[PDB]
Amino acid sequence: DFRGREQRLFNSEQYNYNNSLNGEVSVWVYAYYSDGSVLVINKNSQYKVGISETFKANAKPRAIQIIFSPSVNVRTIKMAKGNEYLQRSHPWEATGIKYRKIKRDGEIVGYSHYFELPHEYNSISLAVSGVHKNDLALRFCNRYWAELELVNHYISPNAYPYLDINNHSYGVALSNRQ
């Protein structure tokens, strides 16, 4: 069954994108707004990736989900967030330990850290960064009027990892699968 072997090999080489020499690593930051809309920023880079952005509004950001590709080393993830005197602030937190595996068919398709913002916030500025396990970054942003639209028009056609409000997992298991 060479057809079957070829199918597995082809899918495996696609999971193998997580062991690239070129060290590809992606991060997505999702901002969940009070009108139900979702703003997404995606950066893809090599070796390390981070995003630094502010999310303003009278629909205000209510929650953040950060998702990293499975090539990230979770132990290197750092996050800083702001608008409490700066001069008594923590400069960052090492948030790795809070990231959960997003799994499909027992394969890790990404890592997620999700946190709600207190109602007192009309904004967050946020920087997050991670380095891959062992300049040319492209950034994408968009807004979707609902999480269902995000899922149908962005997550699903790109086969991206995701976790929705119901904690449903999205992504495609590839390692040695047909």
Considering only residues 10 to 29 of the shown chain, the ones binding a copy of itself according to CB under 8 A are 14, 17, 20, 22, 24, 26
87 lies in the binding site for Pd ion (CB under 5 A):
no
CA angle in degrees (0–180, nearest 5) for 67-70-71: 115
* Residue 137 binding: pick among Pd ion, a copy of itself, none (C-beta 5-8 Å cut-off by kind): a copy of itself
75 lies in the binding site for a copy of itself (CB under 8 A):
no
Closest CB to a copy of itself among 5 and 82? Answer: 82
Give whole-number Cα distances, 100 to 1, 57, 65, 69, 165, in Å.
Answer: 37, 28, 11, 12, 15
The distance between the two most distant Cα atoms of the chain, rounded to a whole number of Å, is 66
* Residue 168 binding: pick among a copy of itself, Pd ion, none (C-beta 5-8 Å cut-off by kind): Pd ion
Is 166 exposed, middle or buried, given 0-12, 13-18 or 19+ CB atoms closer than 10 A?
Answer: exposed
Member of 58, 119, 136, 166 binding a copy of itself (CB under 8 A): 136
Structural element, H or E, at residue 21: none
Sign of CA dihedral 60, 63, 64, 70: negative
97 lies in the binding site for Pd ion (CB under 5 A):
no
* Residue 128 binding: pick among a copy of itself, Pd ion, none (C-beta 5-8 Å cut-off by kind): a copy of itself
Sheet holding 107-116, edge to edge: 100-104, 107-116, 61-68, 24-33, 38-46, 138-144
- Token pair in block for residue 148: 């269902």
Closest CB to a copy of itself among 63 and 80? Answer: 80
141 lies in the binding site for Pd ion (CB under 5 A):
yes
120 lies in the binding site for a copy of itself (CB under 8 A):
no
Could you tell me if 121 and 32 are in contact, meaning their C-beta atoms sit under 8 angstroms apart?
no
Closest CB to Pd ion among 23 and 36? Answer: 23
Member of 88, 106, 166, 168 binding a copy of itself (CB under 8 A): 88
**Quick one: DSSP state of residue 153?**
I
Q: Which residues bind a copy of itself (CB under 8 A)?
A: 14, 17, 20, 22, 24, 26, 44, 46, 48, 50, 52, 54, 78-83, 85-88, 91-92, 125, 127-129, 135-140, 158-159
